Amino acid sequence: EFNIFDHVLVPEHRILSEEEKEELLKKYRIRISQLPQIKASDPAVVALGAKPGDVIEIKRKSPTAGYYYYYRLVVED
Amino acid sequence: VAEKTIKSMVSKAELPDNIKEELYAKLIEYNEKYKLKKDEIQAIIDETVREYQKALIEPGEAVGTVAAQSIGEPSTQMTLNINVTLGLPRIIEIVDARKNPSTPIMTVYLDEEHRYDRDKALEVARRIEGTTLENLAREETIDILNMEYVVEIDPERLEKAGLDMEKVVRKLTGSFKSAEFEAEGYTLVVRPKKVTKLSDLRKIAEKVKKHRLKGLSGVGKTIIRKEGDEYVIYTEGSNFKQVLKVPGVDPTRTRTNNIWEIAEVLGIEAARNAIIDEIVSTMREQGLEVDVRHIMLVADMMTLDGVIRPIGRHGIVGEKASVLARAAFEITTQHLFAAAERGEVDPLNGVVENVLIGQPVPVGTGIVKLAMSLPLRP
Amino acid sequence: FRYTRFEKARIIGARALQIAMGAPVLIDVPEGITPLQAALLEFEKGVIPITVIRPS
Amino acid sequence: AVSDDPRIQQVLFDNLEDASDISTQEEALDYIGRLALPGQPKEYRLRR
């Protein structure tokens, strides 16, 4: 089958662990509601098998910095 | 100086990873040409670090306002008006998050089995392209003696469509069960089963001619172009989900003009990337140089909540937490009354509300805090 | 540690405001200059007493 | 009152059978009065 992550427009998506999520929240001094949101019906979310309440680490292909890290919180539809 | 020493110095230097690789490659290229010494390499690395530190943006900069100005100013010299209609209408449609863009265009790529020869590309295109009965027919004539509509088609368009006559009559007979279809020569003859009223003939004649014989819905025109010793298929209309699962089509590089289809099929991050690419392509076509950082900031603000949002009263401004900022932009009475109903509280953390009241804005010098020891003497 | 343009502007404005309503100049200045010019000269001499509080 | 060419006449007949609900002028006047002035007596709607 055609994986959703093989597209050039789709960056790598990885589910953060609990300790990784806590460290990310501590680093930026933000709550879980101050992160960008991603819908639970997103193709990347259903491909990763994530559930609402998790934080997805996105490895963007930066035109300026080469590789850039973005974080999105899974929320219900 | 060996390459290992240069790599070690580059790694020891404080630089981003993308800068480190480019600097190492340039130093390797220049090392054989001019026989660089260790002190020269160290000075080059120090200068690169200093330039990187100098290029860092200072805190407190109004990046959003600068981005909005740097996007809106080149639009004042844009040009208005195959069938791609770029320019100011295109960027307006992009920033307004239009559900259905005007003249959608789908860029379709092919795998290794079809990207080398024109015949495979042509048959893939004819598989993608949607052909119905009304375009195949030469003229329309309602016949009353048989009490049913009669269809005739030219041989050239039937041959180029890729399906023969038997395929056509099997397509309509399976799809439509109210009336039967008979064919002789190069003509279609339709015969009713329980149709007697003349008014019921028109409702069944139009349904027959608009039925799609083959291809994907929403695609009516398809062209093929060659670039970089590869064949790229450009279609009119957008059906991303259907065209993704089509044999002979590479789904890794296939993209569409509709950002909403990209979000629904690929993801929100892919939608943001598509928005950035569309804005960059429009600016490049118009001949206007705009820094990509403004475009990525706009796209990040557009896809903050996981869905594509416009920049108007129904998008980013509509979901602003400030009552005064929302009321000041487009809709004043409705927003104020809605805030009065809910008892909303405006924390005055934004810029517009502080401008309205007469308080310093939280940008530039407004975020600077000062302290001073009192026992100060000359 | 280097001053940003916004921080430098805020420091110069605060010093000029202080000079306008008192706060005698800590360095010798030519006669007939504005308080803003005196604050700029003080900043050039590196004698400003105003610091910047940064988040931590 | 429209034309005599059979192509126009076919569309005319189609319109006539599609609009066979109204038989006389009074019913069409009732429709016009209902659209212009809904919720009014029949005489007032007819006059309007």
mmCIF file of N, CA, C and O in Angstrom, chain C:
data_model
loop_
_atom_site.group_PDB
_atom_site.id
_atom_site.type_symbol
_atom_site.label_atom_id
_atom_site.label_comp_id
_atom_site.label_asym_id
_atom_site.label_seq_id
_atom_site.Cartn_x
_atom_site.Cartn_y
_atom_site.Cartn_z
ATOM 1 N N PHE C 1 27.094 39.671 26.027
ATOM 2 C CA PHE C 1 25.877 40.452 26.212
ATOM 3 C C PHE C 1 25.912 41.727 25.377
ATOM 4 O O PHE C 1 26.812 42.554 25.527
ATOM 5 N N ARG C 2 24.927 41.880 24.497
ATOM 6 C CA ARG C 2 24.809 43.058 23.652
ATOM 7 C C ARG C 2 23.387 43.594 23.718
ATOM 8 O O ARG C 2 22.425 42.836 23.867
ATOM 9 N N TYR C 3 23.266 44.914 23.614
ATOM 10 C CA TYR C 3 21.964 45.562 23.655
ATOM 11 C C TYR C 3 21.269 45.456 22.305
ATOM 12 O O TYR C 3 21.887 45.646 21.254
ATOM 13 N N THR C 4 19.976 45.149 22.339
ATOM 14 C CA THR C 4 19.167 45.199 21.134
ATOM 15 C C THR C 4 18.801 46.646 20.814
ATOM 16 O O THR C 4 18.983 47.556 21.628
ATOM 17 N N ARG C 5 18.289 46.859 19.599
ATOM 18 C CA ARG C 5 17.899 48.207 19.196
ATOM 19 C C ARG C 5 16.745 48.727 20.045
ATOM 20 O O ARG C 5 16.733 49.902 20.431
ATOM 21 N N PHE C 6 15.770 47.867 20.351
ATOM 22 C CA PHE C 6 14.655 48.277 21.200
ATOM 23 C C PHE C 6 15.123 48.601 22.614
ATOM 24 O O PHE C 6 14.689 49.599 23.203
ATOM 25 N N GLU C 7 16.009 47.772 23.173
ATOM 26 C CA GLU C 7 16.527 48.030 24.513
ATOM 27 C C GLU C 7 17.336 49.320 24.553
ATOM 28 O O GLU C 7 17.211 50.111 25.496
ATOM 29 N N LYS C 8 18.171 49.548 23.536
ATOM 30 C CA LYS C 8 18.951 50.780 23.474
ATOM 31 C C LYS C 8 18.047 52.000 23.352
ATOM 32 O O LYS C 8 18.277 53.019 24.013
ATOM 33 N N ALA C 9 17.011 51.912 22.513
ATOM 34 C CA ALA C 9 16.079 53.026 22.364
ATOM 35 C C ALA C 9 15.343 53.310 23.668
ATOM 36 O O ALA C 9 15.170 54.474 24.049
ATOM 37 N N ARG C 10 14.908 52.258 24.366
ATOM 38 C CA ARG C 10 14.219 52.443 25.640
ATOM 39 C C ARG C 10 15.140 53.065 26.684
ATOM 40 O O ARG C 10 14.724 53.955 27.437
ATOM 41 N N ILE C 11 16.398 52.618 26.735
ATOM 42 C CA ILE C 11 17.355 53.173 27.689
ATOM 43 C C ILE C 11 17.616 54.644 27.391
ATOM 44 O O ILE C 11 17.648 55.482 28.302
ATOM 45 N N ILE C 12 17.798 54.984 26.111
ATOM 46 C CA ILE C 12 18.059 56.371 25.736
ATOM 47 C C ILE C 12 16.856 57.248 26.057
ATOM 48 O O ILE C 12 17.005 58.370 26.557
ATOM 49 N N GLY C 13 15.646 56.752 25.786
ATOM 50 C CA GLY C 13 14.454 57.515 26.117
ATOM 51 C C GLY C 13 14.300 57.747 27.607
ATOM 52 O O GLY C 13 13.974 58.856 28.041
ATOM 53 N N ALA C 14 14.543 56.708 28.412
ATOM 54 C CA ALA C 14 14.458 56.859 29.861
ATOM 55 C C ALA C 14 15.499 57.844 30.377
ATOM 56 O O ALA C 14 15.199 58.682 31.237
ATOM 57 N N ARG C 15 16.728 57.766 29.860
ATOM 58 C CA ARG C 15 17.775 58.683 30.302
ATOM 59 C C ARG C 15 17.466 60.120 29.900
ATOM 60 O O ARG C 15 17.695 61.049 30.683
ATOM 61 N N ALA C 16 16.955 60.325 28.683
ATOM 62 C CA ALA C 16 16.591 61.670 28.250
ATOM 63 C C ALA C 16 15.444 62.227 29.083
ATOM 64 O O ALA C 16 15.443 63.415 29.431
ATOM 65 N N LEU C 17 14.460 61.385 29.412
ATOM 66 C CA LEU C 17 13.372 61.823 30.280
ATOM 67 C C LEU C 17 13.887 62.190 31.666
ATOM 68 O O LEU C 17 13.441 63.178 32.258
ATOM 69 N N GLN C 18 14.825 61.402 32.200
ATOM 70 C CA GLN C 18 15.416 61.724 33.497
ATOM 71 C C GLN C 18 16.170 63.047 33.449
ATOM 72 O O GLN C 18 16.054 63.870 34.366
ATOM 73 N N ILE C 19 16.944 63.269 32.385
ATOM 74 C CA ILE C 19 17.711 64.504 32.249
ATOM 75 C C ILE C 19 16.782 65.705 32.102
ATOM 76 O O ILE C 19 17.081 66.796 32.606
ATOM 77 N N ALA C 20 15.638 65.525 31.437
ATOM 78 C CA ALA C 20 14.718 66.639 31.218
ATOM 79 C C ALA C 20 14.163 67.185 32.531
ATOM 80 O O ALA C 20 13.948 68.395 32.663
ATOM 81 N N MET C 21 13.927 66.317 33.513
ATOM 82 C CA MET C 21 13.323 66.713 34.782
ATOM 83 C C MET C 21 14.282 66.498 35.950
ATOM 84 O O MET C 21 13.896 66.007 37.013
ATOM 85 N N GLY C 22 15.549 66.877 35.769
ATOM 86 C CA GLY C 22 16.567 66.711 36.789
ATOM 87 C C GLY C 22 17.691 65.812 36.294
ATOM 88 O O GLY C 22 18.076 65.881 35.122
ATOM 89 N N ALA C 23 18.205 64.971 37.202
ATOM 90 C CA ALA C 23 19.213 63.958 36.900
ATOM 91 C C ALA C 23 20.413 64.557 36.175
ATOM 92 O O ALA C 23 20.534 64.400 34.953
ATOM 93 N N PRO C 24 21.293 65.271 36.880
ATOM 94 C CA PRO C 24 22.410 65.947 36.209
ATOM 95 C C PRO C 24 23.311 64.970 35.466
ATOM 96 O O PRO C 24 23.485 63.818 35.869
ATOM 97 N N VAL C 25 23.870 65.451 34.352
ATOM 98 C CA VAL C 25 24.682 64.603 33.488
ATOM 99 C C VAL C 25 25.938 64.156 34.219
ATOM 100 O O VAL C 25 26.598 64.943 34.911
ATOM 101 N N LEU C 26 26.274 62.875 34.066
ATOM 102 C CA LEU C 26 27.434 62.298 34.732
ATOM 103 C C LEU C 26 28.738 62.565 33.994
ATOM 104 O O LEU C 26 29.808 62.264 34.534
ATOM 105 N N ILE C 27 28.679 63.116 32.782
ATOM 106 C CA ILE C 27 29.866 63.430 32.000
ATOM 107 C C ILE C 27 29.749 64.858 31.488
ATOM 108 O O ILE C 27 28.664 65.442 31.444
ATOM 109 N N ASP C 28 30.892 65.420 31.104
ATOM 110 C CA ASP C 28 30.913 66.768 30.552
ATOM 111 C C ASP C 28 30.285 66.774 29.164
ATOM 112 O O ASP C 28 30.595 65.922 28.326
ATOM 113 N N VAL C 29 29.400 67.736 28.923
ATOM 114 C CA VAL C 29 28.695 67.834 27.648
ATOM 115 C C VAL C 29 28.824 69.255 27.114
ATOM 116 O O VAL C 29 28.917 70.206 27.904
ATOM 117 N N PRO C 30 28.846 69.450 25.796
ATOM 118 C CA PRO C 30 28.875 70.812 25.255
ATOM 119 C C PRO C 30 27.579 71.554 25.541
ATOM 120 O O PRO C 30 26.502 70.962 25.639
ATOM 121 N N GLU C 31 27.700 72.871 25.680
ATOM 122 C CA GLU C 31 26.547 73.703 25.987
ATOM 123 C C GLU C 31 25.615 73.812 24.785
ATOM 124 O O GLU C 31 26.042 73.759 23.628
ATOM 125 N N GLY C 32 24.325 73.968 25.072
ATOM 126 C CA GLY C 32 23.326 74.160 24.043
ATOM 127 C C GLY C 32 22.776 72.901 23.413
ATOM 128 O O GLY C 32 22.027 72.999 22.434
ATOM 129 N N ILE C 33 23.116 71.727 23.933
ATOM 130 C CA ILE C 33 22.634 70.476 23.367
ATOM 131 C C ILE C 33 21.321 70.087 24.035
ATOM 132 O O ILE C 33 20.974 70.566 25.118
ATOM 133 N N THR C 34 20.578 69.209 23.370
ATOM 134 C CA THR C 34 19.317 68.705 23.886
ATOM 135 C C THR C 34 19.560 67.589 24.899
ATOM 136 O O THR C 34 20.631 66.975 24.914
ATOM 137 N N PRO C 35 18.588 67.322 25.779
ATOM 138 C CA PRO C 35 18.724 66.167 26.684
ATOM 139 C C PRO C 35 18.877 64.841 25.958
ATOM 140 O O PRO C 35 19.568 63.946 26.461
ATOM 141 N N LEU C 36 18.246 64.688 24.790
ATOM 142 C CA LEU C 36 18.448 63.484 23.990
ATOM 143 C C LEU C 36 19.897 63.367 23.534
ATOM 144 O O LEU C 36 20.476 62.274 23.548
ATOM 145 N N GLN C 37 20.502 64.488 23.132
ATOM 146 C CA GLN C 37 21.911 64.479 22.753
ATOM 147 C C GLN C 37 22.799 64.130 23.941
ATOM 148 O O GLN C 37 23.796 63.414 23.791
ATOM 149 N N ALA C 38 22.454 64.629 25.131
ATOM 150 C CA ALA C 38 23.217 64.288 26.328
ATOM 151 C C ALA C 38 23.116 62.801 26.644
ATOM 152 O O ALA C 38 24.112 62.169 27.014
ATOM 153 N N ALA C 39 21.919 62.224 26.503
ATOM 154 C CA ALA C 39 21.757 60.791 26.728
ATOM 155 C C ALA C 39 22.539 59.978 25.702
ATOM 156 O O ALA C 39 23.141 58.951 26.038
ATOM 157 N N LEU C 40 22.536 60.422 24.442
ATOM 158 C CA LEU C 40 23.311 59.737 23.411
ATOM 159 C C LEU C 40 24.805 59.803 23.706
ATOM 160 O O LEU C 40 25.526 58.815 23.521
ATOM 161 N N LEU C 41 25.288 60.959 24.168
ATOM 162 C CA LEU C 41 26.695 61.085 24.536
ATOM 163 C C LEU C 41 27.037 60.194 25.724
ATOM 164 O O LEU C 41 28.116 59.589 25.766
ATOM 165 N N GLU C 42 26.132 60.107 26.702
ATOM 166 C CA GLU C 42 26.351 59.226 27.846
ATOM 167 C C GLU C 42 26.420 57.767 27.413
ATOM 168 O O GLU C 42 27.250 57.001 27.917
ATOM 169 N N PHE C 43 25.546 57.363 26.488
ATOM 170 C CA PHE C 43 25.593 55.998 25.970
ATOM 171 C C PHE C 43 26.879 55.741 25.195
ATOM 172 O O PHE C 43 27.460 54.654 25.289
ATOM 173 N N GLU C 44 27.330 56.726 24.413
ATOM 174 C CA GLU C 44 28.575 56.573 23.668
ATOM 175 C C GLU C 44 29.766 56.440 24.608
ATOM 176 O O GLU C 44 30.698 55.673 24.339
ATOM 177 N N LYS C 45 29.753 57.180 25.717
ATOM 178 C CA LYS C 45 30.819 57.086 26.706
ATOM 179 C C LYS C 45 30.740 55.820 27.550
ATOM 180 O O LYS C 45 31.683 55.538 28.297
ATOM 181 N N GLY C 46 29.656 55.057 27.450
ATOM 182 C CA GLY C 46 29.500 53.855 28.252
ATOM 183 C C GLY C 46 29.365 54.121 29.735
ATOM 184 O O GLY C 46 29.971 53.411 30.547
ATOM 185 N N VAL C 47 28.580 55.131 30.110
ATOM 186 C CA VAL C 47 28.436 55.560 31.493
ATOM 187 C C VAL C 47 26.997 55.429 31.985
ATOM 188 O O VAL C 47 26.685 55.843 33.104
ATOM 189 N N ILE C 48 26.123 54.826 31.187
ATOM 190 C CA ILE C 48 24.696 54.758 31.532
ATOM 191 C C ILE C 48 24.513 53.888 32.771
ATOM 192 O O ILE C 48 25.261 52.909 32.957
ATOM 193 N N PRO C 49 23.613 54.251 33.690
ATOM 194 C CA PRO C 49 23.390 53.414 34.876
ATOM 195 C C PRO C 49 22.189 52.489 34.750
ATOM 196 O O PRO C 49 21.968 51.633 35.613
ATOM 197 N N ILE C 50 21.407 52.649 33.688
ATOM 198 C CA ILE C 50 20.168 51.894 33.530
ATOM 199 C C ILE C 50 20.484 50.521 32.953
ATOM 200 O O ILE C 50 21.170 50.404 31.931
ATOM 201 N N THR C 51 19.985 49.478 33.609
ATOM 202 C CA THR C 51 20.157 48.106 33.159
ATOM 203 C C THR C 51 18.860 47.582 32.550
ATOM 204 O O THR C 51 17.812 48.231 32.593
ATOM 205 N N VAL C 52 18.943 46.384 31.977
ATOM 206 C CA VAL C 52 17.817 45.741 31.311
ATOM 207 C C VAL C 52 17.513 44.436 32.032
ATOM 208 O O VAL C 52 18.413 43.616 32.249
ATOM 209 N N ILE C 53 16.250 44.247 32.403
ATOM 210 C CA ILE C 53 15.799 43.012 33.033
ATOM 211 C C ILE C 53 15.313 42.068 31.941
ATOM 212 O O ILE C 53 14.425 42.418 31.156
ATOM 213 N N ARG C 54 15.893 40.873 31.891
ATOM 214 C CA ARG C 54 15.522 39.886 30.893
ATOM 215 C C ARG C 54 14.876 38.672 31.555
ATOM 216 O O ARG C 54 15.218 38.323 32.689
ATOM 217 N N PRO C 55 13.928 38.020 30.880
ATOM 218 C CA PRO C 55 13.301 36.827 31.461
ATOM 219 C C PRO C 55 14.300 35.692 31.627
ATOM 220 O O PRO C 55 15.238 35.536 30.841
ATOM 221 N N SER C 56 14.088 34.894 32.668
ATOM 222 C CA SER C 56 14.961 33.764 32.959
ATOM 223 C C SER C 56 14.164 32.582 33.500
ATOM 224 O O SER C 56 12.938 32.641 33.596
#
